[PDB]
């Protein structure tokens, strides 16, 4: 049962002068995309608090990863679903390497500790695995699943305009681009192939959720998908993220996130139609950390 929200007092929406006419706001599935000034937060806000909403947010820190988890983890607590339950899981092979990291109320962590896989490409991989089934807390714990990538910091709001059923988030390398041009999985042979007229969008790894039944379906989806090829002795090109793709161009999400949610500054800028950088790529030596 949903109460009644309270009386506010806001700004009017006009029918006929739209937030944004400088981008897609909607697919053609009726899925909100969400950019900024597309929300009334104030609204999102009332609406997920009077359900008591606890969102749990998974995170990987194996091996060297462990060394992005303090300024991930301060970073979330400035701007990360401030004034909700928040249930940060963060999956590692290095419980003591997980910095001390000062919560506010009615936020919590649990350190869960898991196998380090050799290759970059399996660590990468088995979180869909690791996620998905391995892991029977969430539906008891958290309402909502978000699971991202480590070696990033929040540098502005990412609240609950992000919750939904299943959500993706738009690559920053690939949001202007035609389908032909995304780096799907093209070899029939994998279970990720998308062949060049099918696609909506090219959706990024490091960025995806939605409720926990929702989410655990994706995951078990995807490493079932992931045991197949490797069965059929193929990795798909771009592993778990191909994966993902495929997931969701046969289960649409129910809201998009524009690359607000997931920017590269040092590769990309600060194009014109970003009027906020909300999640961002840390800068890292690849051939090192990994
Ligand atoms: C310089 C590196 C070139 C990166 C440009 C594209 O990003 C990569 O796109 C791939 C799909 O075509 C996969 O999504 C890779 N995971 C992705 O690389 C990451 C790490 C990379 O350092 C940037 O942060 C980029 C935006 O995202
Ligand atoms: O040695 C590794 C390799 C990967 N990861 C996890 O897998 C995610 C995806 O890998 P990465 O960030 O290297 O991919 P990229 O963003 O460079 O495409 C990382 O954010 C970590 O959460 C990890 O913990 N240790
Ligand atoms: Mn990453």
């Given at each position: 049962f949903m109460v009644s929200l309270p009386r506010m007092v806001y700004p009017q929406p006009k029918v006929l002068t739209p937030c944004r006419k400088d981008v897609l706001v909607?697919?053609?599935?009726?899925?909100?995309?969400?950019?900024?000034?597309?929300?009334?937060?104030?609204?999102?806000?009332?609406?997920?608090?009077?359900?008591?909403?606890?969102?749990?947010?998974?995170?990987?820190?194996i091996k060297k990863y462990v060394?992005?988890?303090?300024?991930?983890?301060?970073?979330?607590?400035?701007?990360?679903?401030?004034?909700?339950?928040?249930?940060?899981?963060?999956?590692?092979?290095?419980?003591?390497?997980?910095?001390r990291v000062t919560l506010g109320t009615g936020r919590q962590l649990s350190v869960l500790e898991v196998r380090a896989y050799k290759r970059w490409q399996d660590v990468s991989m088995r979180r869909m695995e690791m996620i998905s089934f391995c892991e029977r807390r969430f539906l008891s714990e958290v309402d909502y699943l978000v699971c991202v990538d480590v070696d990033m910091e929040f540098r502005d709001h990412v609240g609950v305009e992000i919750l939904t059923p299943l959500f993706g988030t738009l690559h920053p390398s690939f949001y202007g681009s035609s389908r032909e041009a995304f780096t799907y999985e093209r070899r029939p042979?994998?279970?990720?192939?998308?062949?060049?007229?099918?696609?909506?969008?090219?959706?990024?790894?490091?960025?995806?959720?939605?409720?926990?039944?929702?989410?655990?379906?994706?995951?078990?989806?995807?490493?079932?998908?992931?045991?197949?090829?490797?069965?059929?002795?193929?990795?798909?090109?771009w592993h778990d993220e191909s994966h993902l793709n495929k997931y969701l161009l046969r289960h649409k999400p129910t809201?998009?996130?524009?690359?607000?949610?997931?920017?590269?500054?040092?590769?990309?800028?600060?194009?014109?139609?970003?009027?906020?950088?909300?999640?961002?790529?840390?800068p890292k030596n690849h051939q090192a950390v990994r």
């Open positions: 909607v697919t053609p599935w009726l899925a909100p995309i969400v950019w900024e000034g597309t929300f009334n937060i104030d609204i999102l806000n009332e609406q997920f608090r009077l359900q008591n909403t606890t969102i749990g947010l998974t995170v990987f820190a060394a992005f988890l303090k300024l991930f983890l301060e970073t979330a607590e400035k701007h990360f679903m401030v004034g909700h339950r928040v249930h940060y899981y963060v999956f590692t092979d290095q419980p003591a390497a997980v910095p042979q994998s279970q990720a192939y998308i062949p060049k007229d099918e696609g909506d969008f090219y959706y990024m790894g490091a960025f995806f959720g939605g409720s926990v039944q929702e989410v655990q379906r994706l995951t078990r989806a995807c490493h079932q998908a992931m045991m197949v090829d490797q069965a059929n002795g193929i990795e798909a090109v809201k998009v996130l524009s690359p607000e949610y997931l920017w590269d500054q040092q590769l990309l800028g600060w194009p014109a139609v970003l009027r906020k950088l909300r999640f961002t790529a840390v």
